[PDB]
């Protein structure tokens, strides 16, 4: 659906059939419900106890075929321009994607062999850091978050005696705003994520009734305005 | 359904926006009668009885057809005096038996009479024989007739 | 249109002729039916239990719309040569709000 | 039923007015109503749970009938054209149908013989892949998606020391929009999935009455406007 | 009962005894509410949890009598006319009857002999088709449904070295519509499914009194107007 | 009890005018709420489950006297005039009675002896036919229903090696319509089923007051024109 | 939404504070008639 | 504002044309829209039922 017909059927939806019955919502407002929609509905559908089928991302054809046109491979950049601190001694820090949104597969080539990588809890690096040898099994590599500017920085624990010369990422690319119209023609200087102009819908048009209605449910619950509502759909914002 | 709404009828009434009008009135009725006339039918709708014609017998029995155009009737105590232009220019009296109009015609002549101008009357009645009808046009002298 | 009424033709009941037209309108419809009673089959008209109940009229200019509007003119009468009187009581309108 | 049938019985069943003089409900929103209620119902009857029955695509004979009209068999083109980057070294990126709505079989055709399609999840494929071999079994082959340009990019991950002649994708095709007058007419550039002429319903006649009751309801539903009913019926809407 | 019968007997229900106290329905009207009516009437008895007893369509003397007049037995006819693309190497084209609601048996004549036909569902396909031999049993053959053209189009994948000679298919026949009377001679241009004309139900005379009692209510429901009516019977539609 | 009883104790118990000039509840009216009552007496009777008692058709000795009146025994006629097509190779087509409501014994006498007719479902047809002999037991004969028009037509799979002489059908007859007087004298072309002259009931005495509180409780349901009310008493239409 | 009111309209009306003022009556109207004229229109606004 | 209303000319009926503008304001603020009717686009006004 083009941003017109995301715009057009919202109003056969939240003002009663296209009637003027309802209280009436300005193309920025449409556009801003819209934004947050869909990244609801990202984060739900993503999540399995957060939808209403218990399913995540590839637990069924639906849910792949839903995340299939954010899915991005990209490969992670050596961050040896800033000379940080890192918590572990073998930990060779490098900088992801700077449109990532949720991480789903991490691989290594090192010189033995490429090794999956398994990101690791601060629980679980106590653990295995207290143990005689305090390195991964032969066929994965570590990975905890340091210390990031602006950005996302992780340190990847491979084993001793490797070299890291690369490091893919597969993620979920953070999706861009649905915009229905010029916002600077009428709005002064009004920006949903940095763009003041027409911005159509990066997701495969099956999960878009999904973010619409999604939209219209939000709009309705913002302007009935009782706490309750509000907090009612607010649980579905995680 | 859902819902309902009585009407009563206790008159009719115009001029008044359709948005709102009063349930209780109807707006535009033909030939009916709210109030109760020959039987207990009053605030309920119910018909017009219509007319019966009386023939106009003179006293020998004969049909007596009226001339043309009235302009004017009287009634003094039970005679009907009409003023009828037509051919001639007539007067009748009218009084009406038990089933027919004992009609005679008092004059038939050329008393000038128009249309443009009917007929204003006003009857007395002093005694048996002297039974006066004055009546005006606007345009003629007034007369008298017993 | 549910409405009580009765006709009669000297001292007799009538229990078959009420009314013979139903013309109802508003700024945008107009529909009219004859206002038969056929004991069978449906008809516009249909009496039970000493109660007259009319479907009123659709639209002419499509003949399945409804007479939706806020408001409307609702016009009983009879057409057909006849002498009864027709008492006519009241009468209830029942719509959908 | 045709587009006039759809119309007509959508008027019956919710009575509305076909005159303008009062507008009534009009040609747009019913067609924007009965596509929304026909997603709704493809959604809901390929996942067992999203229905009363808990019965599938192929759960039962009338769901079988139900996507008959939508199942479409079509090759994977070879997107050999842009060098981008994958997951996997041995990942050839195969473009899919642009009109595809879900998968349901997948085939490719190597050197070895043909080998039927796993759809790898995130985690299975890290799992997989932290063993020795890290090779399929011998007659399946594994799938998982990749940066995609406005339509859907696969990595096929053969074994190696094997090549790929053939990708056949089995798959639901998106449905065509249901709407009942050229908009173009009276409605000056309003679109419905970017079409604006008469389009009749692609599916069998068996779900023409369920998209129809379920049109009713979303109408119903909308119109009435009130938060309870459109997140209720909003539930329906995966 | 004639269609004279299903009129007539529709306002001895619906409008308050023929009292014409309910709001009155046109022919066009009960006609599109009895055709809703027997669809409606034969999805619910023929899956079994669709109707109140739990039986389906051979689970009592009573379901084997109410589609003994919908059940008919006609010939596949090879699709050799349009060279279109198979998902299986083996499979044999073949083109359903027009008139097809639900298939209930479908059997193949082959050189070898008859071979009964099993409707092999998307993951059963998969799971049979990742192991050594990936044949149907001696006495059984699959079928899936292919890229279809307003019509049924259903792959025979039958066992190689062996030849398709004949295709049988038993099914339930759509019905035909209800309609009681001449719906051009007052309404315009109406159908019910591409028929103007009066048609007379085309079933057996035992389950006329559960569509008129279903057209009944359905038309008491579609006339209170509520939205929890209209859902709430929507519920029986499938 | 007969026709002017009927009229009269459901004027008894329903509390109607026998007068013309009030027109109360006529006779065309309570002569269709008698027989839809006694189609629903019968339905309910007939499946165990429909009832309160949870007895079906020879399931206590009231229910044997309560369908004794319409048990009938008549013989198939084979219907070798119409050339058409059968689903088995073996299948001898008979034409069933014209007046037939439910089957409940069938029998097939052969030259090799009486056989009893088992009416084997749809998937019972494909499981057995999935087996190296795919012939009934010795001493039984299969039947599937097939294509019929305007009547039933029944498929009789007996097995192999062996002629059909005679088809007996002993099932219940379809019950004639309770009407209380000639419709034809003041309703002017008004059926039932087809009748139009006085019928009286064909059943037992002993069900005629089940029949005549049905009819009441039918006629009350409906003259309220409550939906609730015409749901609940749709449910024991079956 | 929340809340309604209906708005009547059996005159024109000013010199009353607007906190105060009466939804039967109209602030300021320019060329209409409240009165049936040419028309059954009393106490609907109509042209001039 | 939910309002009834209707323009004629001479005895024909106008389902399009009421009103041209709507001024609404108070100690602070002001607003006002042309009350234009597009059937198929959202508009300041629209008519239904």
Redesign the interface.
Known sequence: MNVNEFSNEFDVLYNNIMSNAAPGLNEYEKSVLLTKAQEEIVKNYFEPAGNKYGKGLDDSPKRQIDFSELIKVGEGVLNTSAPTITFDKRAKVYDLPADLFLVINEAVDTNAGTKQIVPISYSDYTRLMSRPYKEPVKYQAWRIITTSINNISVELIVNSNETITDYKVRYIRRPAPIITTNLSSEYGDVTINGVSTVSECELNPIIHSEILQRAVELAKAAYQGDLQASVELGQRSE | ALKKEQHFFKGMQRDLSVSKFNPEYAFDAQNIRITAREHDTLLSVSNEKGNKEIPLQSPSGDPVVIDGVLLGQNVLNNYVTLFTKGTNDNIYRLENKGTYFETLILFSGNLNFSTDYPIESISVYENNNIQKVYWVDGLNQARVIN | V?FRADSWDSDN?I?NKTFDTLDVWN???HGTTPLTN?????????????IW????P??I??????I????A???L?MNTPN???????????????
Chains 1, 4, 5, 6 share one sequence.
Request: without cysteine; aromatic residues 14%; hydrophobic residues 30%.
């Open positions: 549910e009941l229990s700024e945008y419809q056929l004991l069978g089959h449906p008809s516009p008209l249909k009496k039970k239990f000493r109940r009319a479907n009123i659709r639209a200019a499509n003949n399945r719309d409804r939706r509007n806020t408001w003119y609702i016009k009468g002498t009864y009187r027709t008492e006519f009581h009241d009468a209830i309108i029942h719509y959908f709000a």
